[PDB]
């Protein structure tokens, strides 16, 4: 990877970039014919939001997602991991990938509510004041429809709407 350091010496600023250590993909993928990191390791349909060991490889130090052109993921898998990372952040499973705060900023205390499988952003959702009849019930989404094809070990399929 490449870093950038800004140093001000004698009323003069010097901008430089250095190449740091870069991690390498593990040798001998079980499926060399695979076209992306996911299918090269037979991971398609076999990872979830809480698989941070997988998810953490495709995000930036501050929690941002990495471009698809750099990681090599396909559009389908890149979108699945994108949703998985949002749910991982909301679940509190990435405590060392928090947003960068400018000097002098200390967030004010906010109510702590444990949550998981959170599709939407908390602030953008309204209460369900009118539930509606049984034949037209307003449902609360749980999980993501992108993961509908994940391997199901139970006879009941994933319920995405509660």
């Amino acid at each position: 990877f490449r870093e950038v350091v800004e140093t001000q010496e004698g009323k003069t600023t010097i901008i430089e970039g250095r190449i740091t250590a870069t991690p390498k993909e593990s040798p001998n993928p079980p499926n060399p014919s695979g076209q992306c990191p996911i299918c090269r390791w037979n991971l398609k349909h076999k990872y979830n939001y809480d698989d941070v060991l997988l998810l953490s490889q495709f995000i930036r130090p501050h929690g941002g997602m990495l471009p698809r052109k750099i990681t090599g993921l396909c559009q389908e898998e890149h979108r699945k991991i994108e949703e998985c990372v949002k749910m991982a952040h909301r679940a509190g499973l990435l405590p060392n990938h928090r947003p960068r705060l400018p000097e002098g900023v200390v967030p004010k205390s906010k109510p702590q509510l444990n949550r998981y499988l959170t599709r939407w952003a908390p602030g953008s959702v309204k209460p369900i004041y009118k539930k509606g009849p049984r034949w037209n019930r307003v449902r609360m989404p749980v999980g993501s429809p992108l993961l509908r094809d994940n391997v199901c070990y139970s006879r009941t399929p994933w319920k995405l709407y509660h």
Binding site: N28, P30, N31, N42, L43
Partner: peptide, 8 residues
């Protein structure tokens, strides 16, 4: 050290 069907 990974078989053809190995999955992490």
């Amino acid at each position: 050290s990974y078989l053809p069907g190995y999955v992490p």
